[PDB]
A paper describes a structure:
Here, we present a novel polymer-based support and an associated deposition method, with the aim of providing ultralow-background conditions for serial data collection. The supports themselves consist of a thin 2–3 µm thick cyclic olefin co­polymer ([name]) membrane perforated with a dense array of 2–3 µm sized holes and suspended on a rigid frame. To assess the quality of structures that can be obtained from chip-mounted crystals, diffraction data were collected from a range of proteins. These proteins included the insulin, thaumatin and HEWL that were used in initial tests, and also TD1, a tubulin–DARPin D1 complex, EcR2a, a class Ia ribo­nucleotide reductase radical-generating subunit, rhodopsin–miniGo and PepTst, a bacterial peptide transporter.
TD1 and EcR2a are both soluble proteins with crystals grown using vapor diffusion, rhodopsin–miniGo is a membrane protein with crystals grown in vapor-diffusion plates and PepTst is a membrane protein where crystals are obtained using LCP methods. In some cases, such as EcR2a and the membrane-protein complex rhodopsin–miniGo, direct deposition provided satisfactory results. The data collected from proteins loaded onto the chips compares favorably with similar structures in the Protein Data Bank (PDB). It was interesting to contrast the data collected by small rotations with the stills data. Although a detailed comparison between these two data-collection modes was limited by the different data-processing software, doses per position (ten times higher for the wedges) etc., the final resolutions were similar. This suggests that the intrinsic diffraction limit of the samples using this preparation method may have been reached with both data-collection methods.
Residue numbers in the entry:
A (entry chain A), B (entry chain A): 1 to 339
The structure:
């Protein structure tokens, strides 16, 4: 029942963000929510290409790094490339079929596109610092630690796409699939969406910000400066991306957009809190892997775990969740100059 | 069975364009088909924003147009906005779930994104020349003539998405859906893809080029020059877009990518020819609507129909179809300076 051009002339100003009539005409003279129009415009204004950044000195730095410092740098880079491999495609495959207002439709496609630039920038970095990029790229899919995070993150998107496919084909109700019982509930699909957005918000607002700290710690030592300039550009995009999911999550939560979402968001409250806590703990456990073979000037397991708690508290509050950790000051204030 | 990060470490250089393992890692150090990497790079190099173009004189021109010339201009603009409303979303929703090589995945997301810029540029034009843009935007969905083309074009995408949803959930075979028979065939889904790409190629390579002729005919009269500058930028993107579908269609046809596609493409040959002929006839009938109330200097029903035949022959040949019309010279050679 999904359609790439819905024939009904609907008032797009009254549609909900999600699960309404698929957007027919893409117009930009008006918005229900102008934050999405402001995010499009800002992301457009930021357009950059990786090749605009000189990464030619980073091979020298990378080779001069002690082996455990190479391990810190490349593990971090591998994790970023994993995450924006998912982010390049997943907003488009998972969110587009559900969007019912043009400004959010176009924001999501602009968001995903900006992720492909990030993915291309990671390739630009990798091929300029290692001799065999395939070894790096292949380790991303087979790395025991990396593959752990990939599973959980992608499952939020996959479960949403699968249930979407059932809902578009069958609609709500209980159905027969080769003698199996399939209960299709829009309330449940709305739950899958809200949890997915919560997971995506933790991804961009916490998981990538932990990784930014690792990259900029090298830059603080005047090393891997080409990488650091690219990460500055990525982080500036990332701030737009998390603002997007913050607004989607809060507009759903308030009931201003879908009153059914407000009560779903309350039912999901503990499960949202738990998923944020788990992601923060997973990033703490990732720090044990990053520093498995030793630490470096300005960054170690303890410092980075403090930063996880610091940033997690900020992000959870902004989407209305209680704080899981003691309130603390920024343990790495030097990171602010890069952001 | 669709996954946003497939866990198997596969050789992406050996995957097919479509229906293979979904792309896990987005890497750009290598390509199976470097045309898609070249298209990404070129489209990135072309990045433009509508607001970079001064459209401030076009309101004066538009108001000075006789009523039938306003009708020609705005009907053409309405049709373009319809078509790139579909093109902004549909490559992402319809093609992304099926792509199994990273360079094609990223090309498709870059292609769709560049379409949203076109859609935003049409909004930029509309709001600068009419007093009530809503009347324009609403007529796009309700216009009897426009809605006719929207139905057929969107059906190629919708049928492909629906069958995709059955294939990811159920896989190949015959299944029970509430006591109904559903035969899911990958060969059939491959047929839906190939016909869709043929339809999309006619869309961008013929239907939009007919509309470019209308826009540039005004520019030839030194009218609507702001519009014309935007259409120049759009047409330059369009040439990349049709090159993309040309290569997908030809690589599938050759069997170089999927040997099963080569025999499917032969079985589909007459039906591909017929769909191109129908689109050309539909564009000829659209010219009767554009010039319903009279013609203008340099462009009329007869001239535009000659251009339909001229351009249709070129596009059909490039994707290996026989020519439906007598071979003729460019009836509007002035269009070349704008392209
Ligand atoms: Fe990113
Ligand atoms: Fe992001
Ligand atoms: Fe376009
Ligand atoms: Fe196009």
């Amino acid at each position: 029942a999904y359609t790439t051009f819905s024939q009904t002339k609907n008032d797009q100003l009254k549609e909900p963000m999600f699960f309404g009539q698929p957007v027919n005409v893409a117009r930009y003279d008006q918005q229900k929510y102008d934050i999405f129009e402001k995010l499009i415009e800002k992301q457009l204004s930021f357009f950059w290409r990786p090749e605009e950044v000189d990464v030619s000195r980073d091979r020298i730095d990378y080779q001069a790094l002690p082996e455990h410092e190479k391990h810190i740098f490349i593990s971090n880079l591998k994790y970023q490339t994993l995450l924006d491999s998912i982010q390049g495609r997943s907003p488009n495959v998972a969110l587009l079929p559900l969007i019912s207002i043009p400004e959010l439709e176009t924001w999501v496609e602009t968001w995903a596109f900006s992720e492909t630039i990030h993915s291309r920038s990671y390739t630009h970095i990798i091929r300029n610092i290692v001799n065999d990029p395939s070894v790096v790229f292949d380790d991303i899919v087979t790395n025991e630690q990396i593959q752990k995070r990939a599973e959980g993150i992608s499952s939020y998107y996959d479960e949403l796409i699968e249930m979407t496919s059932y809902w578009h084909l069958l609609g709500e109700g209980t159905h027969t699939v080769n003698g199996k019982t399939v209960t299709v509930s829009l309330r449940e699909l709305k739950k899958k969406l809200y949890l997915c957005l919560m997971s995506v918000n933790a991804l961009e607002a916490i998981r990538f910000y932990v990784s930014f700290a690792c990259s900029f710690a090298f830059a603080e030592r005047e090393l891997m400066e080409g990488n650091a300039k690219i990460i500055r550009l990525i982080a500036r995009d990332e701030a737009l991306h998390l603002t997007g999911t913050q607004h989607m999550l809060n507009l759903l939560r308030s009931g201003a957009d879908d009153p059914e979402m407000a009560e779903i968001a309350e039912e999901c409250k503990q499960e949202c809190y738990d998923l944020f806590v788990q992601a923060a703990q997973q990033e703490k456990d990732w720090a044990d892997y990053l520093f498995r073979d030793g630490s470096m000037i300005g960054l170690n397991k303890d410092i980075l775990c403090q930063y996880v708690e610091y940033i997690t508290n900020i992000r959870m509050q902004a989407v209305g969740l209680d704080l899981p950790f003691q309130t603390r000051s920024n343990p790495i204030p030097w990171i602010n100059t890069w952001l």
